[PDB]
Amino acid sequence: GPSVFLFPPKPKDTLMISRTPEVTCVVVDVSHEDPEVKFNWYVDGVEVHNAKTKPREEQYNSTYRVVSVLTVLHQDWLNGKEYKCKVSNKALPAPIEKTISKAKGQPREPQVYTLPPSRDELTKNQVSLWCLVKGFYPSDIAVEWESNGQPENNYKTTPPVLDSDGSFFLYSALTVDKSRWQQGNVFSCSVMHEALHNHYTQKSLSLS
Ligand SMILES: *[C@@H]1O[C@H](CO)[C@@H](O[C@@H]2O[C@H](CO)[C@@H](O[C@@H]3O[C@H](CO[C@H]4O[C@H](CO)[C@@H](O)[C@H](O)[C@@H]4O[C@@H]4O[C@H](CO)[C@@H](O[C@@H]5O[C@H](CO)[C@H](O)[C@H](O)[C@H]5O)[C@H](O)[C@H]4NC(C)=O)[C@@H](O)[C@H](O[C@H]4O[C@H](CO)[C@@H](O)[C@H](O)[C@@H]4O)[C@@H]3O)[C@H](O)[C@H]2NC(C)=O)[C@H](O)[C@H]1NC(C)=O
Numbered sequence: 001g002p003s004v005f006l007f008p009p010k011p012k013d014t015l016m017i018s019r020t021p022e023v024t025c026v027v028v029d030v031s032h033e034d035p036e037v038k039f040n041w042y043v044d045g046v047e048v049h050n051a052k053t054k055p056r057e058e059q060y061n062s063t064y065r066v067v068s069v070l071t072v073l074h075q076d077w078l079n080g081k082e083y084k085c086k087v088s089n090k091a092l093p094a095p096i097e098k099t100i101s102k103a104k105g106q107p108r109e110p111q112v113y114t115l116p117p118s119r120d121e122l123t124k125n126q127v128s129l130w131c132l133v134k135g136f137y138p139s140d141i142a143v144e145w146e147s148n149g150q151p152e153n154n155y156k157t158t159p160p161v162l163d164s165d166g167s168f169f170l171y172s173a174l175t176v177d178k179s180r181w182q183q184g185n186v187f188s189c190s191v192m193h194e195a196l197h198n199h200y201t202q203k204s205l206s207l208s
Pocket of ligand 1 (some may be wrong): 009021022023026060063140
């Protein structure tokens with residue numbers, strides 16, 4: 001018969017105001033004979049009616065994949081609300097219920113350190129600026145760079161690495177033309193994580 005899977009939002013989506021985090025309820029092994037799926041959604045056991053029904057997608061094995069997507073509020077996900085997908089389809093004797101919520105664990109605030117470009121990096125016409133982020137739990141984090149109210153995109157960020165104390169660290173390296181740095185322009189590292197005040201912190205650096 002048909003089988004159900006319930007996915008959380010992408011972790012970065014729950015920390016970024018520029019994203020809409022979604023809980024996604026996927027039904028597979030839906031037959032061509034009985035292809036209609038009914039979804040009910042509950043947030044902490046209270047029904048809601050704003051889910052999006054997606055068009056069913058033909059899979060290459062005599063079945064449909066049927067999906068319902070429920071937008072969640074950033075704060076609702078971060079405050080631990082429980083999202084329940086209830087699925088119905090003639091092939092099933094009774095409805096399938098699945099529930100998902102944010103993982104538990106004691107959260108820990110990242111500490112953010114900016115580092116000016118090295119002494120080797122100077123002889124070249126581009127310099128890299130570093131933003132070291134450490135001591136954070138859980139691993140879910142977003143890191144961006146900006147300057148003069150505008151995004152800076154020439155950066156690489158390591159995925160989070162697990163430390164022996166149970167927390168995570170990473171670095172982000174932004175590369176920029178040396179002239180911009182030598183001109184006294186201010187580059188900012190932005191970090192979004194569930195444990196920061198306002199879920200958002202920023203550190204700047206510029207030349208002395
Ligand atoms: C007929 O053919 C189809 C496809 O060809 C088959 O369909 C498959 O059925 C399987 C069940 O038998 C099922 O297996 C489970 O898979 C899950 C993992 O699924 C994810 O990863 C897979 C790749 O590894 C993908 O195939 C899936 O698409 C899925 O990817 C996730 O998709 C999310 C939903 O869209 C997506 O989240 C959203 O993404 C958007 C961005 O676009 C937003 O961010 C939004 O907010 C998100 O919510 C994610 O990006 C993505 N996530 C991840 C993590 O990949 C797996 O967990 C599960 O295993 C667990 O459960 C079993 C219990 O059965 C347990 O035993 C295991 O140990 C484990 O705990 C299953 O393996 C397949 O997923 C599914 N494939 C598809 C494409 O639907 C049929 O099975 C075929 N029929 C037959 C008879 O053969």
